[PDB]
Amino acid sequence: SDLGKKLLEAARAGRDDEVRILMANGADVNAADVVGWTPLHLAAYWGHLEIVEVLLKNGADVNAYDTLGSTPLHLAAHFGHLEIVEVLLKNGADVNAKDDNGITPLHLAANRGHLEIVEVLLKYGADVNAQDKFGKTAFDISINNGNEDLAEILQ
Amino acid sequence: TDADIAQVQVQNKLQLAMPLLPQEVQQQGVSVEKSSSSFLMVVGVINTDGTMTQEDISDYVAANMKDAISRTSGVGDVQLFGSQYAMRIWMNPNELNKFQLTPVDVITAIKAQNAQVAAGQLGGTPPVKGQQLNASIIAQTRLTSTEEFGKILLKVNQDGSRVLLRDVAKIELGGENYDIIAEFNGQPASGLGIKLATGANALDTAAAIRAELAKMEPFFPSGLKIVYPYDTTPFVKISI
Amino acid sequence: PGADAKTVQDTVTQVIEQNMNGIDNLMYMSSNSDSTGTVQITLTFESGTDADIAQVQVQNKLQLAMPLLPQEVQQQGVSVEKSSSSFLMVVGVINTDGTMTQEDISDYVAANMKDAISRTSGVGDVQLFGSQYAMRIWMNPNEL
Amino acid sequence: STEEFGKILLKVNQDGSRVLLRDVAKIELGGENYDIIAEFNGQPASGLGIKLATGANALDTAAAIRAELAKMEPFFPSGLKIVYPYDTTPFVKISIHEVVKTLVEAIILVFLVMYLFLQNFRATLIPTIAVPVVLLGTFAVLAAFGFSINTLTMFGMVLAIGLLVDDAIVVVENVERVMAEEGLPPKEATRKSMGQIQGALVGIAMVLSAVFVPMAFFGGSTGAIYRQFSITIVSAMALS
Amino acid sequence: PGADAKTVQDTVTQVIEQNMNGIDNLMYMSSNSDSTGTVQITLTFESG
Amino acid sequence: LPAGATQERTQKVLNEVTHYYLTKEKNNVESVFAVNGFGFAGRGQNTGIAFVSLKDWADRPGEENKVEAITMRATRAFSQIKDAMVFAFNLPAIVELGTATGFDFELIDQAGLGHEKLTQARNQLLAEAAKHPDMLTSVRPNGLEDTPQFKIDIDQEKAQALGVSINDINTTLGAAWGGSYVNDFIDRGRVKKVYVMSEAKYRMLPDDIGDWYVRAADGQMVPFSAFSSSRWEYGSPRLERYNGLPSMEILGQAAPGKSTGEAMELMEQLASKLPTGVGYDWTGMSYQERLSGNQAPSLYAISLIVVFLCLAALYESWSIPFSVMLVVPLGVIGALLAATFRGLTNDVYFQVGLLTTIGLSAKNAILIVEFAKDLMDKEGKGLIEATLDAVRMALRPILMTSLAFILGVMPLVISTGAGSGAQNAVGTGVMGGMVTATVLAIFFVPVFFVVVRRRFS
Amino acid sequence: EDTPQFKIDIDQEKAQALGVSINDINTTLGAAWGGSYVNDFIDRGRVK
Ligand SMILES: CCCCCCCCCCCCO[C@@H]1O[C@H](CO)[C@@H](O[C@H]2O[C@H](CO)[C@@H](O)[C@H](O)[C@H]2O)[C@H](O)[C@H]1O
Ligand SMILES: CCCCCCCCCCCCO[C@@H]1O[C@H](CO)[C@@H](O[C@H]2O[C@H](CO)[C@@H](O)[C@H](O)[C@H]2O)[C@H](O)[C@H]1O
Predict the structure, then answer these.
(1) Ligand 2 pocket: which residues have CB below 6 Å?
(2) What is the rounded CA–CA span in Å between residue D184 and residue D192?
(3) What is the total count of domains within chain A?
(4) CB-facing half-sphere around the CA of B136: CA atoms within 13 A
(5) Of B186, C35, F46, F209, which has fewest CB within 10 angstroms of its CB?
(6) Which residue CA neighbors atom 15 of ligand 2 most closely?
(7) What's phi and psi for F165, nearest 5 deg?
(8) Does E24 touch chain D (CB under 8 A)?
């Protein structure tokens, strides 16, 4: 739809005022581009906290997955958006969500060394023994990257 | 003699020799300059807060200042009194021998795992009928940090243990060379030794350099300051 | 061929830009690197600058930077042209009976027309809108 | 040939069967890239972008291009046609024509106005000679300074007509008055008539130079445009 | 090196010659391609 | 078209554009040259241009069948087109020079902030510019926006474990999906390139990645999926640089009534409030304007000074020159009245027209003052007597020149054919300028001379 | 003036006998003691 595509651009751009007007007029919150990204996917990626909250209030799928099985929590956790990770988890985001590669938010958070997000994910019951397609855990990533602080947390 | 034609003729002949030169010499970049032998001025750079070392200042000058000054009309040659940073892999022969590895293996691994790969596109031309998706494919990119160079996988042992580059070498940002170390009144410093291009006006070129330096100053990190420890042009202006 | 905007910029555009030194009467330098695998670096010079001297000075600095570029970029090569010029006319070549593709027409123009138009009195430059044929090997992964 | 590329040997199997390139790939003559799809009224299209050479004649060059394409007509495959979607020569053809028209119409208008007031054909013939002489002279000065016949230089002469026509009328009209008021013969009348205006005409030339010459000393693209009108008008005025 | 006159004409001489258009004051252009793989393209220009 | 739009989708729009011009504008349009995959602002499958070629001007009578009319009709017609930005526009007068209307701004990364941070700083400037419609209009990026791209990570350990070399992996991927220029062959006596690449249907979608196999050292064929992982990210399809530093080009123009110089000063003010390490600079038309604007005052000064000095020498007085120089406005008012009425602009053709109008008006006055002064100096006549005798003698030759020259530029004013836009700009300002210069000067020149002569001695 | 320099002779026979390539020896000596420019990387947006 027209408004559905306007919401994707608005969510990406971080135009809080435009998102508000679109939610009132009833712009499709489950609208997806060709890669399968919802407004929540885009908001989570570019780090637009207020829009993530507004979209979730308007019945947006918190566990929406793209054509490679990645969710908004994957994106939020990977690009170090602490406050967005918390909001998503509070609204029932699958903390152990596996993409097509078997990669979880914890794997991505560990790889970029976001210590705060790793502890938030573990607090909401992130599987620390969870393995990707190569059989690697968040701990295996930490010792390979040489992040001692992160390696200490995952024990 | 027209310096432009002299340079063209000299380079025309150099290009016949270039293919015969060792690959290591070609890859360092051969240069052809038309300038005075002496320095027009030395542009000095110091940190008054002492927040940046001689090595830090030298890299900043090389990375943010030198190129723009080198492209300025009348600037024949620019000598960096210091070195730009390079990714330094300081090899350990004891650790290399321990894992049955050599500098050849290290060089092969770096070329393989520090690579910028052209991977093509999804739905690239010529496409099939009814294609909706067009996106660039991104594979390996150039490494950006000592950490990424550190976790370069050299080999996997029989037991399954991984030999990383940091296990056989110390990794840090450091000068391409460590030959040139500059000071200004006993204080850590870098600088640009500028030579006047053949036939160019000393005063006009000096003015053009100061104008280009003025565009850089606003975006300096805290402490960094331009000093003028050697300039031949003030004498020319004042004497007249 | 098959390179993204960042690959082109960080292996070609940055390397060439860093070697555009010791060139006279340069006002400013601008470039773009796109996901079609293309880079265009435009160097604009002072009004009254000899365009031939400007071009050869740029060409000469590029030649010495060629060994710093990727092997695939050295293969394709790097063109240095006077871009400030404009077109006198555009000769269109079409197929009406639908027996020739744009590739077929472009090859014929390249082989049988372009050179003769280039040799015509008062013609300064000729640019083919298209390319001559290439031997295309369209690989099959199932058979490989 | 595609046939030879098809026969390229890749592998020889144990049983003795041969794997050729045509067995693992489709082989054809195609384009270097498929990014651009060019169509002319829906039909497949290519083309040539032609630029004019330095110091060449656009109208001669276009004629020569059309003459060369005409010799290729007999060798074209069935279906191939030449079209001219963009061509700048019609402009220059009309630009020169409309200029020649204006300068002819200007001389015809002067003739009528000269006759309406002075009422003798001998008087009307002096501007009819003088104006062409000045205009031809302007082209010689245009050539000397390395300028070309273009839209700007062509309208530059049209804008100068008033100044050229005036010089002719002023000189002749003033002689006709002197004779009518004092009764002097043409020769004695001209000596006195020129004696009154010769100082002013030189003064006018210096004044008008000061108005137009500085316009040529603008820099960049705007200066280049202004310099076309400036040198054309000042030259035409100076010869007049 | 090693190329015949026909091979080097098609791969070098014609490739260069077809790019030698729109040069100022060009009177004529003469070239030869020989069996040693050597190409020589001479461009003669207007007097002055 | 929007981000990630394919060649086929762009072609369908160009087909509608082509269909319209050969249907609704059959009487005007000769041909449509549809170039799918190229745009001046950036290339890709989602961009394209339709070069419209019209019939001869003689076969298109009236403003209704001119480019500006067809442009407006086309732009309105293509407004309805969904998921595509389509509009027609005329060519600049000089194609060599570019658009040359508005300003050309460069936002520069001066401290290695990176692409993402330069985008955020750009969005901040565009947003702030949008708050000033009264000064700035259509302030937009010239470049392209970030698009979804397929990031594939090659697992080094798995590749080494299975005995698959990285060169083989990256060659297989690059050659198949991207294409590879191998070497040259000779087609009918002409050297041409050899390209190896995947057949279309095996390099379209991410699932096709797993159909490509690489041979290990032990001779086993390993699928690409075995040693690779993939995720979606965003990246630039066109990265810009200015003077060796990462940049983003921003186009815009001064709002109706406001000058470009004023609009530039605001952009500078807005630019100074951007994050640390984000600089700016002016390029193209803007760079040209700033330097040209700095020259204008000194050239106007030199012009007026030398005009005065020449007249001072001619008349042998410091005062009388003023009597000639006071005519300047008499011609300029007529040019402006004619330009404002016909709805033309203060353009190059108009500006050169003023100087020639000013030139001939000055010439008329120079001879009146010369004759008036000569009568006073030689024959010893009075100020008013000499002035009345001067204007009497000067009437006929001023009317003859004016009548001849006004009729001479009449065709240029009313011309509606090829190159009429230039002829109009030439004739309009000159005709109106000559009319007022002729009518006013014959009454005002004697007033100037008499008043100046009375004031000084 | 001339200075002391460390002259090292590689024995070709011994290298061949032990199956040690001369390319590996020269690279090992050159890379370690002289330094080797391998390839480029990106330091804060600049190729180095
Ligand atoms: C008021 C009369 C005063 C006399 C002085 C004025 C002279 C005429 C002014 C224009 C000067 C340029 O004149 C212009 O020259 C060029 C050659 O360079 C010609 O150019 C062209 O002429 C014909 C026109 O059919 C073409 O076929 C031919 O291919 C080409 O040479 C123009 O047709 C001519 O109009
Ligand atoms: C018939 C005789 C005709 C006379 C023709 C005389 C030749 C014309 C000479 C043109 C030379 C250019 O003139 C020169 O321009 C530069 C700008 O580039 C001016 O430089 C200007 O810079 C600043 C810019 O902020 C101005 O504020 C300032 O008013 C002025 O100094 C010089 O002051 C002027 O001397």
Answers:
(1) D 209-210, 213-214, 217; F 294-295, 297-298, 302, 306
(2) 9
(3) 1
(4) 28
(5) B186
(6) F295
(7) -70, 150
(8) yes
Kindly state whether D47 is in contact with chain C, defined as any CB-CB distance less than 8 angstroms. Answer: yes
Chain B contact present for G24, CB below 8 A? yes
With tokens 């100076």, the residue in question is D238
Query: Would you call C143 an interface residue with chain D, using a CB distance cutoff of 8 Å?
Result: yes
Write out chain E residues lying below 8 Å of F185, CB-based.
none
Query: What burial class does residue A35 get, using C-beta atoms within 10 Å of its C-beta: 0-12 exposed, 13-18 middle, 19+ buried?
Result: buried
Backbone break loci in chain B, preceding residues, C–N > 2.5 A? none
Q: Which CATH architecture has domain F1-90?
A: 2-Layer Sandwich (3.30)
Shortest CA gap G4–chain B (Å): 20
* Dihedral sign of CA atoms F90, F96, F101, F106 in order: positive
Does residue B126 have a cis peptide bond before it, meaning omega lies within 30 degrees of 0?
yes
Nearest CA to F151 among B66, G34, A99? A99
- The count of other CB atoms within 10 Å of the CB of residue G8 is 6
Q: Is B160 helix (H, G, I), strand (E, B) or coil?
A: coil
Ligand closest to the CA atom of residue D230: 2
Confirm or reject contact between B125 and chain D (CB < 8 A).
yes
Pair B103, G36: CB distance under 8 Å: yes
- Classify the C-alpha dihedral D25-D31-D32-D34 as positive or negative: negative
Q: What is the DSSP string of F372-397?
A: HHHIIIII---HHHHHHHHHHHHHHH
CATH number attached to the domain at F147-239:
3.30.2090.10
Ligand nearest to the CA of D104: 1
| Domain carrying residue A2 | 1-155
User: Which residue type, as a one-letter code, is found at position A135?
Assistant: G
Nearest Cα to E14, choosing from F332, F225, F129, C111? Answer: C111
Alpha helices in F102-190 (DSSP H): 115-130, 156-162, 166-173
Q: Contact C91/D24, CB-based, under 8 Å?
A: no
The CA D96 to ligand 1 mean position distance, Å, reads 7
Rounded to the nearest angstrom, the gap between the alpha carbon of residue F386 and the centroid of all alpha carbons in its chain is 54
Sequential DSSP letters for chain C: ----HHHHIIIIIHHHHTT--S-TTEEEEEEEEETTS-EEEEEEE-TT--HHHHHHHHHHHHHHHGGGS-HHHHHH-------S---SEEEEEEESSS---HHHHHHHHHHHTHHHHHHSTTEEEEEESS---EEEEEE-TTT-
Distance D92 CA to ligand 1 centre (A): 10
Q: Is B24 exposed, middle or buried (0-12, 13-18, 19+ CB in 10 A)?
A: exposed
How many other C-beta atoms can be found within 10 angstroms of the C-beta atom of residue E32? 12
Q: Which residues of B touch C (CB under 8 A)?
A: 4, 7-8, 11, 15, 18, 23, 26-27, 29-34, 67, 70-73, 75-78, 116-121, 124, 136-138, 141-142, 197
Shortest Cα–Cα distance, F189 to chain D (Å): 11
**Exposure b/e, F434-447, CB count within 10 A at least 16 = b:** bbbbbebbbebbbe
- How many other C-beta atoms lie within 10 A of the C-beta of residue A64? 19
Residue C50: closest CA among A34, D152, F105, B8: B8
For residue B106, the enclosing domain spans 87-175
Of F139, F134, F132, F145, nearest to F103 by C-alpha is F139
Q: What is the CB < 6 Å shell around ligand 1?
A: D 57, 59-60, 63, 96, 100, 103-104, 107, 132, 135-136, 149
3-state secondary structure of A7: helix
Asked if C56 contacts D15 with a C-beta cutoff of 8 angstroms, the reply is no
Q: Are strands F136-141 and F278-282 parallel, antiparallel or unpaired?
A: unpaired
Bridge partners (DSSP) listed for residue C34: F238
Q: Point out the ligand nearest to the CA of residue D108.
A: 1
